[PDB]
Paper text:
Pif1 is a multifunctional helicase and DNA processing enzyme that has roles in genome stability. Pif1 proteins are monomeric enzymes and members of helicase superfamily 1 (SF1), while the 5′–3′ polarity of unwinding place them in the SF1B subgroup. The hPIF1 helicase has the domain architecture characteristic of the SF1B RecD2 helicase subgroup. The overall organization of these domains is similar in all nucleotide bound and free structures determined. hPIF1 has three structural domains, two RecA-like domains 1A (residues 206–381, blue in Figure 1) and 2A (residues 382–435) and domain 2B (residues 436–548, green in Figure 1) with a SRC Homology 3 (SH3)-like fold, in addition to the small functional domain 1B within domain 1A (residues 280–300, cyan in Figure 1).
The structures we report are of constructs from residues 206–641 (apo hPIF1) or 206–620 (the structures with nucleotide analogues bound). In the 1.44 Å apo-hPIF1 crystal structure residues after 620 are not seen in the electron density suggesting they are disordered. SUL1 is stabilized by hydrogen bonds with the main chain atoms of the loop residues from the Walker A motif and the side chain of the Walker A K234 residue at the beginning of the α2 helix, situated at the 1A–2A inter-domain contact area. Tight packing of this area is maintained by interaction of the inter-domain linker R381 (motif IV) with the carboxyl group of Q206 at the N-terminal part of the 1A domain. A second arginine, R584 (motif VI), interacts with S557 (motif V) and the carboxyl group of I554, contributing to the rigidity of the inter-domain 2A–2B contact area. We also mutated K485, N486 and N495 of the poorly characterised B (residues 477–486) and C (residues 494–499) motifs within domain 2B that are characteristic of the SF1B RecD helicases sub-family. K485, N486 and N495 are in exposed loops where a sulphate ion is located in the apo-hPIF1 structure (SUL2 in Figure 1B). Residue K414 was also selected for analysis and we also included the E307Q Walker B motif variant as a control. K414 is also in the vicinity of a bound sulphate (SUL3 in Figure 1B) and is conserved between mammalian and bacterial Pif1, but it is not in the ssDNA binding channel revealed in Bs and ScPif1 structures. However, a comparison of our 1.13 Å AMP-PNP structure with our 1.44 Å apo structure shows that the binding of the nucleotide induces movement of the Walker A motif (residues 228GSAGTGKS235).
Residue numbers in the entry: 203 to 618
Amino acid sequence: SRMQLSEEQAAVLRAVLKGQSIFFTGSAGTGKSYLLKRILGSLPPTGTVATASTGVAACHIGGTTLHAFAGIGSGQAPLAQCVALAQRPGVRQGWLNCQRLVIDEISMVEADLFDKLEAVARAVRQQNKPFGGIQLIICGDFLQLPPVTKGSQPPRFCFQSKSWKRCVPVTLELTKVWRQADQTFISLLQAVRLGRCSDEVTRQLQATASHKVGRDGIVATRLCTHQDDVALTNERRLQELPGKVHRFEAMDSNPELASTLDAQCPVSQLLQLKLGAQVMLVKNLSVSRGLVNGARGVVVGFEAEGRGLPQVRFLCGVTEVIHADRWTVQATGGQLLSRQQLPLQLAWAMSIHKSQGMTLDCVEISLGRVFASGQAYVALSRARSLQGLRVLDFDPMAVRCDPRVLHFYATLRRGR
């Protein structure tokens, strides 16, 4: 075990191994990802179900989406219907065989959906205990973006559900800046997350507006709010370059489901590159050499023969030819599907949604406009340090947070 756990992280692990349902929570940069991986290595594979609310986060933990596991379609039908969908052959044994259920990215789950899931559990398993007697291991942070709904009315946070207190009797916090993160920058994030933008926070961010962050042909990625505008942007920037197009097609086990893999793993069926393309790594190839998720680079060549694989120069100081990697996704019903493709994305632009669970080493962020509660904090959390970041037109009016969620955190802090 490469690194020793902190006293706060050790407490979580203890509780989990005694069989207790627990929610653990804290800002970015407190070691939540490291702790999830240590929990999943410590538990028996048999009966342990790793899930996340998103595709992006599910892949980072080698699991599946909560939507796919559940098998209740959208969750919006009456209980008896949801319950009938969960009874379907493959979907049903997943519920029966689950002993411990890990759920990352809990901020994304709306309260009415948590309540539907909890009742579906008790019915399918014929067990009167909370969530059908499953040991729940829940990770996230409600000071992130609010949950989305389609349901016409306001969305409600997961902690407002009728079954939350019954299901989650112990909550523990991670508060210290983790040993793989920068003290100065995480301390600034922790102030922004609580809505608190002092004159010194505003100075430190405004001071980055003039920063040159790239070098050696690598330029900063512009962080954006919406995935579709991002794809058009990256495609237009690639079209402007004069080099010939190089195409890389995925090898899929089940090509009749490519759309599903496009939507759940971090790479597509077809990757196009040229000399000069701005790229981002999306697998951890080597932590010790800086080849981690979010590492920024530029294409500097292609192999002259064979498959013509790209040669990438990274900001971290590595130049290397990038080969195909593998991802496995679990479909509703349980079938394992696989995609082999290069672990690279275009990176003139990147959305907040597709960058969850990672940080970039070369990034530009615009924060003069007001966004939702938690938006300024979540965007700044995609950077690593003040050195790798340029903030345009920062305004402390950009910083808003949800007062109901602040009171939830203040109660937790008063405990200890």
